[PDB]
């Protein structure tokens, strides 16, 4: 029917780089 | 200072909890913040463009996640007219059983919502057809978003942190928008139209697998480069064509057939990359219009301060002196934030009006709901962006303006007869208001008394004569394209109007929202909506014009754009502020928009049913608004649940009953004001430091009744939280029980 | 604290001293008119910010005028 | 200054000139 | 399979982002360090 | 594949794209054995010239095998 579980962990692990990125601009922004 | 908020030493030392409210309340007043500079000002609001655009796309990114992992649309390709979309799934550790039960639909394994968007007519139409083409697109859009939230990021750090040239440089961005975030985003997607999503329409499938492979039209950039651009438009697709098949299915890539494509009920497709092609065209031959590095091209600023046309001496260009208006635009953030938010307020309606009577998509136009959430969805948007637009010419007049650097220009000329501008729209929005109430109240009057014959009903001529003379023949003009003897039906020299038989075809039949047929109901909502837009105007505009200084309180402008009062003196000055207007706009914009869905919603829902005389002989008086639309459609929705049990519109009856009480709690803070509350919680502050064990603990920072200014903030957003959140309800609970 | 100004305007009828709930306001030798006085504003750091002043003021708009800015426990009135 | 407003009452009539146009065409006087 | 992951996200979400970031926020705006 | 002129014009295209990008950004062009024209040339060393035309061979065999392998050529 729908995607894979394969296919969700991968959209978590990569859902984990804007994750690290908006850390690192929010943390910008403040600065 | 040396404590939360950061940006404000002044607020920093506050001793009460005020400090917590109006640091979150002017976080993103970057102005405001204390050491702020230009440079700084400009830089930290490009890193927060990146970081907006970031949320929008995971947001996209996530539309495409839930409807791939747990939507149904798979199973909605082969049937979308019979099929509920589904937007995600449900888990609730609140639901019993029987909430469980009810919203198990759409046949799904468990409780889901049902999707009102449109995304499956949407990404159906422009070629998606399994799960993982929605699962990539959701990955890219979060790799998308990781490579601008890096760039926000990137463009705070010093080697690439942009001058404050770079950000003064008109032109160049001007050419760079028209010409590539326009142009060139316009014609790669008449290229994905021409390569993706005619041949998905056409049965056949392209994908990144193929696509190198494949040539969408079988003469490919032969016919291009020779000028032999005719070939392109030959073997369109027939009347008989099925979407997503071969049957019926044409070679044609560039087609100007005009009307909408039979079974679908949409605009063709090869018409719509057709449109992004000319378009692509006119937009990059329009970027090259103004000066850059490269010597030829316009100067705006000589545009605006040039004095002589072919020699004759003139104010400007129009003869309208224009001088410094370049400077006024370029230098001013909330002069340029207003004036976009007026652009996109304007075609964010636009939007709205063309997608109910031009749909795009294929089977959209017969999802009743969705027509409905997404009419209602964009003008309720384009209203809020009309009343920022306002809000920020004002306060782009109060913190910004200076009348040395515009002497003499058009904006002072303006400013010189304000009372002029606003005592006539005083006069248009009376002159509307008492007459079309009073014939409102007219027919309410006499439908009562048993004599409807007696009702001022008024034909719409004029709007009548537009429709015939875009070849409506139901009226019987027999004006410009509804005269088939006309020079604008034939086009005499040329004959060239290919467009024509499709599109009379499409507004001739009855069974679509293209030029819908009005009458005496239509003429009296539009005279309220003229009203409405300029009374909603008239507050904007005055609350604009005096935000520097009126004869009230001629140093407005010193104490800003957002203060409470100038105190009980000189008869007493409740709202007088600029942000005031703002307040008591947003009042008559939610009212207007209210006018314009109530409309909406409701004269389509005659054409649903086939029962168009309903909203024909019913909306000419107030109770028949009142009872028709307002009472007898709501009972579905309030039924969602009842002492029997409950229903898949149990959700929207809840909603419903909430945003009634949203709206009804802001009441308080708009009513109430605050040494009421002051009083009051003095004494509970009191009681707490004379309660035993209830001593050992205290509050850090003092509790104090909210500001003036916070008090509207708050009774606002409530008010237009319950406002939105009830018409929702409303709109999609009784939709969606009349048509599934 | 708010901070309270007087502008040149004054006429010195010492009306803005009396309404004056939290004594801000004291009157100071001045020639600039006919009364030979000005008001002044020392003790900004008591003024809650309430205007009675600004009422009480007869000269077409105002010789004296409160801006209202940072907040103390003094300039919210707060007995706490 | 322009007492007779012969810039302003140009355009003016050209307004009220497309008008009275639109109304030929309304009432069937131009087919 | 991946069903189960609402379980653990929705909690998440519900009640171990609000408690950690209203934890944050309250001993931020009442701290004087910065 | 066949021999075509379409090969011959896309073998002398990535020759021109492969001798722009030397007169664009190579560290050294002027070598010692120089061009005769050297205005034609854009200002060359006779081992740069041959430089630039062999990596428009690797640039357009790649490509020809590239666009015959899709169906292109
Ligand atoms: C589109 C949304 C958006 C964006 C891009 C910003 C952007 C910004 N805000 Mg802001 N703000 C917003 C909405 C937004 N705001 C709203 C809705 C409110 C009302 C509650 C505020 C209230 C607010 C306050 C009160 C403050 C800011 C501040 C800031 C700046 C630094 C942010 C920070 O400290 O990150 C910190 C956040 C994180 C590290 C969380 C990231 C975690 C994820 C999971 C990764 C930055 C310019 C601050 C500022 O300018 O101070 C100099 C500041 O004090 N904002
Ligand atoms: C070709 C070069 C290029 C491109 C593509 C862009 C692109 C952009 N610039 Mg940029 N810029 C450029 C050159 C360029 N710039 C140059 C040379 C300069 C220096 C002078 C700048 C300086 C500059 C600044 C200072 C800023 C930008 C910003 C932006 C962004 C605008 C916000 C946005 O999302 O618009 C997207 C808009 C569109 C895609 C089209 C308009 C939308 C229309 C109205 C909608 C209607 C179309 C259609 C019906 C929609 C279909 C709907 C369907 C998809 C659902 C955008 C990404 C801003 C930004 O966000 O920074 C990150 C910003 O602050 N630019
Ligand atoms: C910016 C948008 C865009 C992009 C990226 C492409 C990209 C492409 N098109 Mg395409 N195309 C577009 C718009 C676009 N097109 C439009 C608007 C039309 C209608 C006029 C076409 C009509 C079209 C045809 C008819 C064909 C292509 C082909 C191609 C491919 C090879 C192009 C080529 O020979 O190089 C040309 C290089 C420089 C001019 C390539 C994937 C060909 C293809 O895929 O064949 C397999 C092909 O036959 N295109
Ligand atoms: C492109 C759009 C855009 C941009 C960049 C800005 C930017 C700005 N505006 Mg502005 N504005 C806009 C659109 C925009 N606005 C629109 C559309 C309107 C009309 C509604 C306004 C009306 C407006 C006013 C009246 C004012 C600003 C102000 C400001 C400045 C500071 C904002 C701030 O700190 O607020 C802080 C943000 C918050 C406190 C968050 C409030 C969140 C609202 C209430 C929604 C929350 C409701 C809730 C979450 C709903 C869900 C509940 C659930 C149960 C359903 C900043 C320059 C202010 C300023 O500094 O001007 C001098 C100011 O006074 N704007
Ligand atoms: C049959 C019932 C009826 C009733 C009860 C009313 C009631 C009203 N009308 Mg109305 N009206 C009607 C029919 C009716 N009208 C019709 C059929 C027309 C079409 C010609 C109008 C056209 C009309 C106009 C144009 C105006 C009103 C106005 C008014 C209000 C004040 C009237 C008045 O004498 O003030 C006492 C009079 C004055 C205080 C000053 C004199 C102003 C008068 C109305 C105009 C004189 C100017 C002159 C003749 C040039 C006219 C210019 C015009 C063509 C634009 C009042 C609510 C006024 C209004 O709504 O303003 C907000 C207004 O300006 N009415
Ligand atoms: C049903 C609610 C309602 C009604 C009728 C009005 C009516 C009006 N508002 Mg409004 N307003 C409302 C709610 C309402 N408001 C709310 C909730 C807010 C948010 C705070 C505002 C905020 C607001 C602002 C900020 C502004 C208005 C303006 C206006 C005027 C618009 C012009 C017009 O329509 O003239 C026609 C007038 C009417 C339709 C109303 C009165 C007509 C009656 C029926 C006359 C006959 C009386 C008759 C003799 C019976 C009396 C019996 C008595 C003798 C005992 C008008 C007086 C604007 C204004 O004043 O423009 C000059 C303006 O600037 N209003
Ligand atoms: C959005 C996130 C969220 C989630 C996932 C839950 C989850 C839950 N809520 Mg809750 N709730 C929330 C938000 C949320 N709530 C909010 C915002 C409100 C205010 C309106 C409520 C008000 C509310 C009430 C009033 C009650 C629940 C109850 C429950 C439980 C479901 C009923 C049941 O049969 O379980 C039965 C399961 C248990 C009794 C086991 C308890 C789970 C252990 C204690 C977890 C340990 C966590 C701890 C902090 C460490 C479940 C644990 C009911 C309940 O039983 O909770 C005690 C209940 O009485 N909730
Ligand atoms: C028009 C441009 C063009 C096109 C369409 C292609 C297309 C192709 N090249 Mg290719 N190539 C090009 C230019 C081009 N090349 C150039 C300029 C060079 C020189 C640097 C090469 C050097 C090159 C090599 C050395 C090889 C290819 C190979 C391939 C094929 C499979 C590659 C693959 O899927 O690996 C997918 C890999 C995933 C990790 C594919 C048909 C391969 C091939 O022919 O295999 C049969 C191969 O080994 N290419
Ligand atoms: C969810 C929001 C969570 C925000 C708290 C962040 C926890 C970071 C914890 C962490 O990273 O700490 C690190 C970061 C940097 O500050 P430091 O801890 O270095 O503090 C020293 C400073 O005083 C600098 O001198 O602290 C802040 O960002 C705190 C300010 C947040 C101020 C709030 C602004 C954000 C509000 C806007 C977001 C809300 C609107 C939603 C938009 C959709
Ligand atoms: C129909 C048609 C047509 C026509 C069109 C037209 C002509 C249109 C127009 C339109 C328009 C024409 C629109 C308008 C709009 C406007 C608006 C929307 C405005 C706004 C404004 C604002 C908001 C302002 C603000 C401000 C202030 C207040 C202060 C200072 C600053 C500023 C300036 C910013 C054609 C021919 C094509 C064809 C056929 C059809
Ligand atoms: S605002 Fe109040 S405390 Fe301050 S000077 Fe005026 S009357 Fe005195
Ligand atoms: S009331 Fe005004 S004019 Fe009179 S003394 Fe006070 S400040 Fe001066």
Same mark, same amino acid.
């Given at each position: ?31 | ?132 083409? &929605? ?30 040239? %770079? ?84 070679? @044609?890539?560039?087609?100007? &057939? ?42 705006? $600023? ?9 020699? $004759? ?143 001022? &009903? ?44 499709? %599109? ?130 709501? @009972? ?105 | ?80 | ?31 | ?34 | ?73």
């Amino acid at each position: 029917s729908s995607i894979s579980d394969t296919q969700v962990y991968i959209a978590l692990v990569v859902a984990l780089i804007p994750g690290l990125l908006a850390w690192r601009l929010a943390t910008e922004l403040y600065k | 200072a040396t404590k939360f908020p950061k940006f404000s030493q002044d607020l920093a030392q506050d001793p009460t909890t005020r400090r917590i409210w109006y640091a979150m309340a002017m976080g993103n007043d970057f102005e405001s913040h204390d050491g702020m500079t230009e440079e700084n000002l400009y830089q930290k609001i490009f890193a927060t463009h990146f970081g907006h655009l970031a949320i929008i796309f995971l947001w996209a990114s996530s539309l495409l996640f839930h409807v791939a992992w747990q939507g149904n649309f798979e199973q909605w390709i082969k049937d979308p007219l019979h099929v509920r979309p589904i937007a995600h799934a449900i888990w609730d550790p609140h639901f019993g059983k029987p909430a469980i039960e009810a919203f198990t639909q759409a046949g799904a394994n468990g409780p889901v919502n049902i999707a009102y968007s449109g995304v499956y007519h949407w990404w159906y139409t422009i070629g998606m057809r399994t799960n993982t083409e &929605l699962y990539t697109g959701s990955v890219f859009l979060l790799l998308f978003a990781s490579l601008f939230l890096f760039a926000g990021w990137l463009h705070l750090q010093p080697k690439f942190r942009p001058s404050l040239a %770079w950000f003064k440089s008109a032109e160049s961005r001007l050419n760079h928008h028209l010409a590539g975030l326009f142009g060139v985003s316009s014609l790669a997607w008449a290229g994905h139209l021409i390569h993706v999503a005619i041949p998905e329409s056409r049965g056949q499938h392209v994908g990144w697998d193929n696509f190198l492979s494949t040539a969408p039209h079988p003469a490919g950039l032969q016919p291009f480069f020779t000028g032999n651009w005719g070939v392109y438009a030959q073997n369109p697709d027939t009347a008989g064509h099925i979407f997503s098949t071969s049957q019926g299915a044409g070679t @044609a890539i560039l087609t100007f &057939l005009g009307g909408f494509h039979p079974q679908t009920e949409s605009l063709w497709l090869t018409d719509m990359a057709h449109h992004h092609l000319a378009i692509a065209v006119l937009f990059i031959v329009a970027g090259h219009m103004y000066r850059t590095n490269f010597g030829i091209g316009h100067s705006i $600023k000589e545009m605006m301060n040039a004095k002589t046309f072919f020699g $004759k001496p003139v104010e400007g260009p129009f003869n309208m002196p224009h001088q410094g208006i370049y400077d006024t635009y370029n230098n001013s953030l909330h002069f340029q934030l207003g004036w976009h938010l007026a652009c996109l307020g304007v075609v964010t309606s636009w939007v709205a009006q063309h997608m109910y009577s031009l749909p795009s998509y294929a089977f959209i136009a017969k999802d009743y709901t969705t027509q409905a959430a997404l009419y209602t969805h964009h003008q309720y948007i384009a209203i809020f962006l009309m009343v920022g637009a306002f809000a920020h010419g004002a306060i782009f007049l109060v913190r910004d303006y200076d009348p040395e650097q515009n002497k003499g220009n058009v904006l002072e000329r303006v400013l010189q007869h304000k009372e002029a501008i606003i005592s006539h729209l005083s006069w248009v929005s009376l002159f509307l208001g008492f007459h079309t109430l009073g014939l409102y109240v007219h027919n309410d009057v006499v439908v009562a008394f048993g004599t409807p014959e007696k009702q001022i &009903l008024i034909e719409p001529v004029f709007a009548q004569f537009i429709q015939a003379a875009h070849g409506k023949v139901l009226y019987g003009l027999d004006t410009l394209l509804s005269n088939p003897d006309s020079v604008a039906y034939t086009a005499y020299p040329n004959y060239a109007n290919v467009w024509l038989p499709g %599109w009379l075809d499409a507004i001739n039949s009855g069974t679509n929202s293209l030029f819908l047929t009005i009458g005496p109901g239509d003429f009296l909502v539009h005279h309220a909506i003229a009203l409405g837009l300029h009374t909603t105007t008239l507050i904007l505009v005055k609350g604009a014009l005096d935000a520097r200084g009126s004869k009230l309180m001629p140093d407005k402008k010193d104490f800003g754009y957002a203060f409470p009062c100038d105190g009980p003196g000189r008869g007493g000055t409740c709202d007088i502020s600029a942000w005031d207007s703002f307040y008591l706009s947003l009042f008559w914009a939610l009212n207007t928009v209210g006018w314009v869905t109530f409309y909406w919603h409701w004269k389509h829902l005659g054409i649903w049913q086939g029962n168009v005389a309903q909203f024909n002989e019913n909306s000419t008086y107030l109770m028949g608004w009142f009872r028709d639309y307002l009472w007898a459609n709501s @009972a579905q929705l309030i039924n969602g649940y009842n002492p029997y049990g409950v229903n898949n519109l149990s959700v929207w009856a809840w909603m419903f009953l909430f945003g009634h009480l949203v709206w009804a709690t802001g009441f308080m803070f708009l009513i109430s004001w605050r040494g009421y509350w002051q009083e009051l919680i003095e004494t509970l502050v009191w009681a707490h430091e004379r309660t035993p064990i209830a001593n050992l603990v205290r509050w850090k920072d003092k509790p104090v009744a909210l500001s003036i200014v916070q008090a509207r903030v708050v009774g606002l957003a409530h008010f237009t939280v319950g406002y939105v959140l009830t018409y929702a309800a409303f709109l999609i609970a009784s939709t969606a029980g009349k048509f599934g | 604290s708010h901070t309270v100004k007087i502008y040149d305007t004054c006429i010195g009828c010492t009306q803005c001293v009396r309404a004056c709930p939290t004594d801000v306001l004291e009157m100071v030798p001045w020639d600039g008119c006919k009364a030979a006085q000005v008001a002044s504003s020392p003790r900004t750091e008591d003024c809650v910010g309430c205007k009675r002043c600004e009422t009480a003021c007869p000269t077409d708009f105002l010789s004296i005028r409160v801006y209202l800015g940072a907040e103390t426990t003094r300039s919210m009135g707060l007995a706490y | 200054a322009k007492p007779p407003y012969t810039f302003r009452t140009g355009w003016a009539l050209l307004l009220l000139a497309v008008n009275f146009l639109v109304a030929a065409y309304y009432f069937h006087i131009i087919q | 399979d991946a069903s189960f992951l609402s379980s653990i996200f929705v909690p998440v979400i519900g009640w171990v982002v609000p408690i950690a970031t209203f934890s944050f926020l309250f001993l931020y705006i009442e701290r004087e360090d910065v | 594949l066949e021999w075509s002129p379409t090969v011959g014009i896309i073998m002398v295209i990535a020759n021109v794209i492969a001798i722009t990008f030397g007169r664009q950004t190579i560290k050294y062009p002027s070598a010692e054995p120089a061009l005769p024209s050297a205005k034609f040339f854009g200002g060359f060393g006779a081992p740069a010239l041959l430089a630039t035309t062999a990596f428009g061979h690797i640039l357009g065999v790649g490509l020809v095998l590239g666009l015959h392998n899709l169906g292109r050529i």
